[PDB]
Amino acid sequence: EVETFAFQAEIAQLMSLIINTFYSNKEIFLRELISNSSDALDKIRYESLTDPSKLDSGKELHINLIPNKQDRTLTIVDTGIGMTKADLINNLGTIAKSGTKAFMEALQAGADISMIGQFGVGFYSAYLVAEKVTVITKHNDDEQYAWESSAGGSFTVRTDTGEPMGRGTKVILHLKEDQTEYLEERRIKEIVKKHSQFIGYPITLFVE
Ligand SMILES: COc1ccc(OC)c(Cc2nc3nc(F)nc(N)c3[nH]2)c1
């Protein structure tokens, strides 16, 4: 069964700003999500220092970038800490409320969209290039979940019956029709080199 939830009003507002504002420098979505992955990998790494059993669900700490032209998706995969149901439905939204407001304020004073990550809400930059985002995630303390949103003010959560992922998070970007450049190998490489060059975890760009 699929539960449908309303975004907090501020988040829905931010999402619509991201979708509606004319802003050509869309490529920053990728460093935002890679950075989110890196924080999540840092978290499970730190936690395992005092409980090595936390790595029973997978020892490898890394990031995969997987384009698929047939499906028109770009997937960012990590083996970080993963998200619980509570994170998905409640906690992320609660923390995002302040960041969103600060960001929206900054945006006059003349900040720009590329600065979204300094407000801890970089995830929503996915909406610069994706019409729909699906997030598959698994935390040690919980079951595997599928979060999904095409914006418009709501998101869904369901327990995921797909392939089990061990531990971590996959963000599946269903790209907008005019955003398929982000499926191209050389465009992805270029972006990773420019914005994510010093991430402390292996980043593997899959080819097709
Ligand atoms: C639905 O997913 C999100 C919604 C809002 C949001 O930041 C407001 C984030 C940001 C984020 N949180 C994450 N937690 C883990 F363990 N791994 C990741 N790769 C994560 N990315 C995710």
DSSP 27: T
CATH code of 1-208, in short, is 3.30.565.10
Q: How many CB atoms lie within 10 A of CB 60?
A: 10
Sequence ranges of the domains in the chain: 1-208
One-letter identity of residue 143? E
Nearest CA to ligand 1 atom 12: 36
Known binding residues are 36, 78, 97, 123
Residue with tokens 């809400």: 121
DSSP 75-139: EEEE-S----HHIIIIIHHHHHHHHHHHHHHHTTTT--GGGGGGGT-GGGGGGGTEEEEEEEEE-
How far apart CA 115 and CA 50 sit, in angstroms, is 35
Mutate to test the pocket of ligand 1, among 92, 100, 137, 139 (most ligand atoms within 8 A of CB): 92
Residue having the nearest C-alpha atom to atom 2 of ligand 1: 135
> How distant, in Å, are the alpha carbons of 6, 43, 94, 96, 114 from that of 91?
14, 16, 5, 8, 24
